[PDB]
Amino acid sequence: ILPVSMTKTSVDCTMYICGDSTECSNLLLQYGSFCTQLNRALTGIAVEQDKNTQEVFAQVKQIYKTPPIKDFGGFNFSQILPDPSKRSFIEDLLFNKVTLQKFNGLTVLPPLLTDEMIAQYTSALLAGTITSGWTFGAGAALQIPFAMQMAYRFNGIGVTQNVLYENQKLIANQFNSAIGKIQDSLSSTASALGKLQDVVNQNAQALNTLVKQLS
Amino acid sequence: AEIRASANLAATKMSECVLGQSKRVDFCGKGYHLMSFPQSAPHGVVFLH
Amino acid sequence: QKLIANQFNSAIGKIQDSLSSTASALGKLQDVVNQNAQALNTLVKQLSSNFGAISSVLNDILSRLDPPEAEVQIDRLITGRLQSLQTYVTQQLIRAAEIRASANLAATKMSECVLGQSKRVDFCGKGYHLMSFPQSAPHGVVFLHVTYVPAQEKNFTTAPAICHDGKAHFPREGVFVSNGTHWFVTQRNFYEPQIITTDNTFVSGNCDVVIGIVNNTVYDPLQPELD
Amino acid sequence: NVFQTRAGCLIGAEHVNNSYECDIPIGAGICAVASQSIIAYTMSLGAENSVAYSNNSIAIPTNFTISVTTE
Ligand SMILES: *[C@@H]1O[C@H](CO)[C@@H](O)[C@H](O)[C@H]1NC(C)=O
């Protein structure tokens, strides 16, 4: 698990410090450009959260589409590939395991890449690596049958390819089974998304102190 | 800046392990790497090495 | 060789054109100049603020006030010019760490791509890497990642192994490819098929296990020499 | 005109339907001149092409282009 972005929160300086007062502002004008300076800092990192998600996901040119028939040599991808019932299955469990309001000057600009887009990039990244393998990252996406791809990755770590075919049926079962335990280990054990939850906890705890200080 | 250090690490783990098979030791999961699968998340990313 | 040299020579040509014509081509280097100079500007503009004293020019508050009372106003400037100078320093210590993160990335891209051919995917340009060329710049560095990109693909029919004499035959370095009528092996990234002799396949076990193989003939070069 | 988004109320742009590669990010998936008018549309991820998977068919390139990006 890795965080890639925080909430694009933004705060209006003068409305926080003064809060719709004419007497206070004309004082705040004496402190030079502190108000202008912070406001620029906060929209400097708000516009950067859009560059973070635009780098992790937007790595591909065209949005590949997974085929209708799924004959992946015995490998069962039902868990990761998208399900049109609603976004993928495992992804749907991830969106349930987190617990993600404005008062005065505070706000939350919405992220540029909507979640049903972010969920779409991660489908092309899935349909290229299932069908094409390495190549959709290097240029024109060449297709290669999956059961043959894993043979060409076994040839990576130093295992001659004969091992796969000669064990294809079992290997597919281990892989299919290993994927199964994931959602179980994810669903059962709470505190499985410790990393993403902090970046939500901290960044929201920090906002809380900002408002408490108004009192 | 702590997140731009992770966003850059995820931008690498996707280019180095989803878009290829990485030879770096222990970069993508304990063991010799075979492949990886992105999965979106609320504000992050989840790899299935 | 001759064509490859032309593509490379030509590709280098378009660079200066794309660089000269399209302004905003050095967006990255220009910001680090813009920001870091914009930030200095605000530091000086802050010298003209009252912070609540009678006047923002330390000479006048000093020119027309007795020392006991003056330092009460001078204190309101010092307490401000300090907070505004210590704000500038902090934003630089943060901004410099963003550059030491890039200076370290360029120190790597030069050691990993100029001083060698990097196998990392998508580290040095989109595509399989061939080489790279440093170029200085005002305050940065510019790499010219010369990469190999395939094109003009054609569909073929594949088969994981070749069952010959009951034994399977797996390709040593290649993929078993057929133009419909004749089967071949070829390097996996550039169409160049060849006749399936024995020295480009290796054998293992009978051909009942692995699904998808086809029945074919692997010719032995030793036999035409026995006769 | 007046057009409503998830980010807010956007007046001055004429909403359209065909998607483009987006120019001026606005928010919630919506971006924003094209022929003397300001158009506000949905981002496109790019041309959607799903490649023809088989269980027995590979596709191998026959020519390349060595190209020079910058960085
Ligand atoms: C876009 O499509 C919707 C639904 O089909 C339609 O109501 C609307 O008029 C269209 N907008 C334009 C500008 O044609």
Curated annotation (Swiss-Prot), chain D:
Known glycosylation sites: N17, N55, N63
Impact reported for S50L: In strain: Omicron/BA.2.12.1
Post-translational modification: The cytoplasmic Cys-rich domain is palmitoylated. Palmitoylated spike proteins drive the formation of localized ordered cholesterol and sphingo-lipid-rich lipid nanodomains in the early Golgi, where viral budding occurs.
Positions of disulphide bridges: C22-C31
Use in biotechnology or industry: Main component of the anti-COVID vaccine Chadox1/AZD1222/AstraZeneca; in which the human tPA leader sequence is added in N-terminus to enhance protein secretion.
Domain of life, source organism: Viruses
Effect of T62I: In strain: Alpha/B.1.1.7
Subcellular location: Virion membrane; Host endoplasmic reticulum-Golgi intermediate compartment membrane; Host cell membrane
Family: Belongs to the betacoronaviruses spike protein family.
Note: Variant D614G has become the most prevalent circulating sequence in the global pandemic since April 2020. The mutation is associated with higher viral loads produced in cell culture and animal models. It would not change pathogenicity nor neutralization properties vs vaccination. May be prevalent because the mutation increases virus transmission in human population.
Domain commentary: Contains sequence and structural motifs very similar to those of a bacterial superantigen and can directly bind and activate T-cell receptors. Activation of a broad T-cell repertoire may be involved in the hyperinflammatory syndrome in acute COVID disease. The KxHxx motif seems to function as an ER retrieval and binds COPI in vitro.
Name of this protein: Spike glycoprotein
Source species of the chain: Severe acute respiratory syndrome coronavirus 2 (2019-nCoV)
Taxonomic lineage from the root: Viruses, Riboviria, Orthornavirae, Pisuviricota, Pisoniviricetes
